[PDB]
Amino acid sequence: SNDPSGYNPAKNNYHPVEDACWKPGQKVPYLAVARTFEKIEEVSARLRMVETLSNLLRSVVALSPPDLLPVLYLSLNHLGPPQQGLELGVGDGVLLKAVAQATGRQLESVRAEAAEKGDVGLVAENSRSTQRLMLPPPPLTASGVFSKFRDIARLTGSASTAKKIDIIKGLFVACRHSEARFIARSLSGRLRLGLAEQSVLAALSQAVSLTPPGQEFPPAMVDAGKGKTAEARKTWLEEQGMILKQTFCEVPDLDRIIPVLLEHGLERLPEHCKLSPGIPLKPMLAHPTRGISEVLKRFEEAAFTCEYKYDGQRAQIHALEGGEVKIFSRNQEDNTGKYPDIISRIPKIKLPSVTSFILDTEAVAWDREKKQIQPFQVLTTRKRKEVDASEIQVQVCLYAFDLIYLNGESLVREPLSRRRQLLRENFVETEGEFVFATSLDTKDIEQIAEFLEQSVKDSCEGLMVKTLDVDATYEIAKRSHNWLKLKKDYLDGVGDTLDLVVIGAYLGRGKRAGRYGGFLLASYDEDSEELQAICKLGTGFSDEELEEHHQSLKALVLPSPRPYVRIDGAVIPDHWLDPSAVWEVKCADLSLSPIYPAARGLVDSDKGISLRFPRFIRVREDKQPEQATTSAQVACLYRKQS
DNA sequence: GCTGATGCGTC
DNA sequence: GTCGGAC
DNA sequence: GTCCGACGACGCATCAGC
Ligand SMILES: *OP(=O)(O)OC[C@H]1O[C@@H](n2cnc3c(N)ncnc32)[C@H](O)[C@@H]1O
Ligand SMILES: [Mg+2]
Ligand SMILES: [Mg+2]
Ligand SMILES: [Mg+2]
Ligand SMILES: [Mg+2]
Ligand SMILES: [Mg+2]
């Protein structure tokens, strides 16, 4: 009702009508969304964030139902269903230019402040706009802002960037209080609330459970939990939370779910939104494990299967009744246009009795001349959009490992033993085109160790381990990481570790604001007696170790780089460091780099070598730079991968 | 018509 | 993708 | 164990700038 500036969606006994900061039927103000973001950001307990978001959503349901979908998208920082491919195309560069123009400041001055503060939002809000007149424009609304975000994402073609900057400036001109901070963070793709998809779903089921949609105004039922004991309320909300969560994992599309929720309610939701081919679903993921002993501990006495973990890209393959075929990525992006070859071979992989299906597969680059798997880096050279089958140069072999839907039957609640059997009996293998994941059903620790050894020898990353009957379903809402990934480089003493020289540091963003978030590392090239940048590094250290690194490196800061340090195309560090510290670094593999100079010319004329999945292990106090891993040793390690 | 910077995607 | 922090 | 956001290499698609 009153000024949204005082809106407190975190207040005790929050009343969806009386504590709202707008009137019935009015559009939700964006400042209401922003104050909710502030109250979420101030706390660290997710459950407190969920209650706060729930309070906002209850007011939205009660007062302004049409703004529910935009508010949810704003809270996720999404533009729409992932398979529709809406993208801002903005990024820090465009955003920082728009902030500069809106405030009249120099781009470079804005850039330096952002790096220092580790946050663009604070730079955007703390500086006023030259564009603004004496009179402010009307206040921003949640749906107004969301549609402008969509406008940005739809702009294409020549001069589209200028048009994007104009929209962004228009937004900043109208911002009040904390609004610009979250507009800017949203545009840069770093909203960083500490609340995301799972907490948004929890807030949404709680909200529509406590404040049902569809009530004649004023709503007779503002809080449907008030008549319940605390224990009964909790059980009820957990039950309703799982209805929404399991539906969303089968149909992760708020454009479909929300209209149903507002019309028919949450209890009827599964009868209106169900898994079907053509709608991407959430995939089953995996937890790491440190060794075979641990696998047996997590699965106890449950029979399990081991499978090769292939190194390609996940492909969720849908065949609709009537013949249409769709392919989606692990993240529900539409990849149908990328695999014309796969689409044309569907008739060859399925027996003629199969009328529809959803397969879970790995797409792996395959050398038809040598009949062998190719590295991930080869796979990534495929074109991605509007590919014509004749133009394909990198062939793919599909390694199928699960089946989620068959002939109109959803298999989500079926044990893997049965899903696998339907997969094996209704689909046809062809060497180099479509094959079942190589597997072993055993409890013998010795066979597992060999089978692991062999998976590496056969061009794979290690093993995936899955129970067959006990907790062996495909219900992502019950456990999204139900499988176990046993990679060689997880083992504490088998992976390849390098001793690398710290040559630069990058100021941290977000959670790393105010310290270093990343470092530039180098190997030692003994031929030229120079240090060659090899990779950046930003994970593996605890917060405590990261504080010690800032302490021990601050004395090594230099105004200018050393002439025997070569970084070529790498990101220039915010702070150059006198080469001295040597860290032990682990990786999964070495890759051919278009930018890093380390070992350039030893394996390839144009490309140096970098690290795949690098992480800090520990400081090497017993090593000086001249004894770090050499560039020749790096080349030798790369060749060793064959 | 070409190239480079870069946003977004894959991992 | 890996990793650590807060719960 | 869950959920989240720090941070990694790298390649296609796109568009500003030539
Ligand atoms: O490393 P990670 O957590 O992303 O691993 C999960 C991914 O591994 C791929 N993959 C390859 N082979 C398999 C099998 N046999 N089973 C399950 N997943 C597999 C997937 O692409 C998955 O996303
Ligand atoms: Mg997307
Ligand atoms: Mg775009
Ligand atoms: Mg930076
Ligand atoms: Mg993989
Ligand atoms: Mg560590």
Residue numbers in the entry: 260 to 901
Question: What did the publication describing this PDB structure actually write?
Answer:
Of the three human DNA ligases, LIG1 is established as the replicative ligase, completing ligation of the >50 million ligation events during DNA replication in addition to ligation events during DNA repair. Human DNA ligases utilize the energy of ATP and catalyze phosphodiester bond formation to seal breaks in the DNA backbone. X-ray crystal structures of the three human DNA ligases (LIG1, LIG3, and LIG4) in complex with DNA have revealed a conserved ligase three-domain core architecture that encircles the DNA nick, induces partial unwinding and alignment of the 3′- and 5′-DNA ends, and distorts the 3′-OH strand into a C3′-endo sugar conformation to adopt an A-form like geometry. Unexpectedly, we found a conserved Mg2+-binding site that forms a junction between DNA ligase domains and the 3′-strand of DNA.
Structure determination with a 3′ dideoxycytidine (ddC)-terminated substrate facilitated trapping of the LIG1 complex as the adenylylated–DNA intermediate, poised for nick sealing (step 3). The location of four coordinated Mg2+ ions (Sites 1–4) at the protein–DNA interface were clearly delineated when 200 mM Mg2+ was present in the cryoprotectant solution. Site 1 is coordinated at the three-way juncture of the AdD, DBD, and the DNA phosphodiester backbone. For reasons further elaborated below we refer to this cation as the high-fidelity Mg2+ (MgHiFi). A second Mg2+ (Site 2, Mgcat) is coordinated at the active site where it presumably acts as the catalytic metal ion. The Mgcat metal-binding site has a slightly distorted coordination geometry, with five of the six octahedral ligands present. The DNA 3′-OH is absent from this structure, but based on positioning of the deoxyribose ring, the 3′-OH is predicted to provide the sixth Mgcat ligand. Mgcat is positioned to stabilize the pentavalent transition state during the nick-sealing reaction in concert with R589, which forms a salt bridge to the 5′-phosphate and the bridging oxygen of the adenylylated intermediate. The octahedral coordination of the partially hydrated MgHiFi involves interactions with the phosphodiester backbone between the −3 and −4 nucleotides (relative to the 3′-OH of the nick) as well as two glutamate residues from the protein, Glu 346 in the DBD and Glu 592 in the AdD. Structurally, MgHiFi mediates key interactions with the 3′-hydroxyl (3′-OH) strand, appearing to restrict the conformation of the strand in the ligase active site.
